[PDB]
Structures are given as C-alpha cells and as structure tokens.
Amino acid sequence: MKTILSSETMDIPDGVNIKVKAKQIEVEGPRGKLTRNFKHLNLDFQLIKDEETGKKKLKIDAWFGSRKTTAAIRTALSHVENLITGVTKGYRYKMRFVYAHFPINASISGGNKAIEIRNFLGEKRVRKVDMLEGVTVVRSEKVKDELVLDGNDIELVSRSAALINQKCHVKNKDIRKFLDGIYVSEKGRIV
Template sequence: MSTKQVEIFQATFDVPDKVKVTLNKHMLLIEGPLGKVYKNFKKIPVEMSVSGNKVSIKAINSRKKYYAIANTALSLVRNLCDGVINGYTVKMKIVYAHFPITVKTKDKLVLVENFQGERAPRVAKIHGATKVASKGDEVTVTGPVLNDVTQTAAEIQAMTQVKNKDHRVFLDGIYQYHKAKGIEK
C-alpha cells in the first residue's frame, strides 16, 4: 500500500445550452424546456459550486468512499439536466388471466382495481412531477426526474405482486417491459 497523498477528486460538468442551473446553499435548481427540478444536496457530502454554465463537484476527502459519493452526485446532476431536456419513460404491461385489471389515477395516487377479484383497489404513490397514463393493457409512466419515474414504476409493480400463491402459475400483475430516455406517447 502506498503512503503518498492521493489527490482529492474534483470534476466539472458542462451544462447544456437549454438548461439553467442555480445553487442556493445546498439546493440545486435546474430549469429546462420540460420544467423546473429541485435537488437537495444537504445530506450528500460534496462541495458543489455553479459558475456560468459549469457545475463543479469536489469530494471532501481523498478516500475511495468520497470519490464514489462525488461521482454519484455528478451522475445525479447529469441525469437531472438530461431529464429537463428529454425526460424519461417507463412502459408497463397489465397481465391478467381471469379478472380484468383496471388502472386509474386520482390526484397523486395510482389505483389498481379488480386485481385478482379484490373489492378494494390497491394504491401506489406518484412521486414528484411524474405522469401516469393507462390505455388498454398498457401503463406509461413519464417525467423529468429519473429517480421519480423509476420509483413510481417500481411501486406499481410491487403492489401487484402475488402473495401466498405460486408465482409461476399466478402471473397476474403489472410488469415493466420498456425503459427509455425521452418522453414517448
């Protein structure tokens, strides 16, 4: 093992032309054609600064752990910038054998009705500025923030998981089959 001092990781990210980034203490505001996105970096141990169209991120220590955290923060900023320009889409398929499943949205909730003949609807939360649309046997989840879109899709899939039955036989549920950058119709 070497005893020489390792440089502290520092990276800069060039913000695309259509995007405006501002930093207020630990709150990063990113504005683009698809709207505004906020991200709080208070609990992420990095030093961040915005100057012009560049975002610079610096690790607070030279250990591998802080190098990884700084790269994660850089990836978050990159995904947020891509999201306000293009957006993200997750497509899901409704699968049922006997009882036809219906998916509805109400306020910030997704209601899955008649799942395996149940009377009460199963409920999942819609995160952030994500939009959920169902048409026929397909559910489309779109939005500008990758974390919010994928978390909403994961909650929809998880709430229709079959319990106390053989999952190889009872295949009813809502399953993700396509994930893409860009908002698709």
C-alpha cells in the same frame, strides 16, 4: 489512503440554467424547475463559465477523501445529469399488465394522478395508488394493457412505478407460476 484530489467535470447544455449555492443545485429548463439538496455530501461544487464561448461546466472534487468518500462524486454528477435530462426531455416509464385468467381493470382518476386496480387475480379488494408530485399516469391506447408514467423527476416517476408494481404482489401462491402483476417494461424520455 486519502487521495489528495479526486475531481470530475460535466458539460451543461446551453438550454439549461443552473445555480449552485451551499451545495443546493437549482436546475431550470423548458419543462420546468427541479431542485436537489446535496448538503449531505462533503464535496466542493463549482460552476465554471468560459467567457469567450459561454458554455457551462460543473466540477465536483473531494480533497483527501477515501474510496467511500470519493465514490459520491460520480453519484452527484449522475444525479445532476438526471436533473438536466428531466428538465429538458422528461422521463417516461412504461408498465404492462400481466395476467393469466383475470384481466386487470385500471381506472385512472381525475387529473391522471391516481389509479385503481380492481380485478387482480379476481380479487374483490380495490387497490389505490396515488401518483407522486409532478408525475401523471395515463392508459396507453396504441398498446394493449399498458400504463404510461410521465414526469420531470426520474426518482419520483420510478418510485410511482415501483408503488404500482408492489401494490399487486401475489401472495400464498408460487409466484413462478402465478406471474400476475404490473411490471416496468421500458424506461425512456418523453421527448
């Protein structure tokens, strides 16, 4: 019914520098740089500075927006929160090999930017997956048959994990019985 004003605000930690211009949000922190283009959202992004204290706040509001339009405010706020978390602490995804008979052989290429799977269900085909920008994959030593994906962008790390998972789908078999694959087992922060 076109609510007059829907508004939400988030606090910005002092250790992160943020810039907003034409719905283009730049996020800066010790771990690096992250960028996002929110031009597709018909919202008003404002950065509020408290002169006495100096803490930052990001306010996103929609004027005369419907429920569908208003649903994007929290989405944008969560995206900005994810950017802050990635630039301060980083993101760490953990994947585990599951197999019944044929152990899965993983070969990390140079730079920890690609992986090779060779013995999935005793298959002679070699599966190739390339890590996305800013995401590295390493073989865990303390945990048996575990892959660790680290990066600054949550979306890129999660998409790399999804690519690894989907590259090892079982076919022409009852997947309930044939449970072999590589699956995400834990989502966390590097720091």
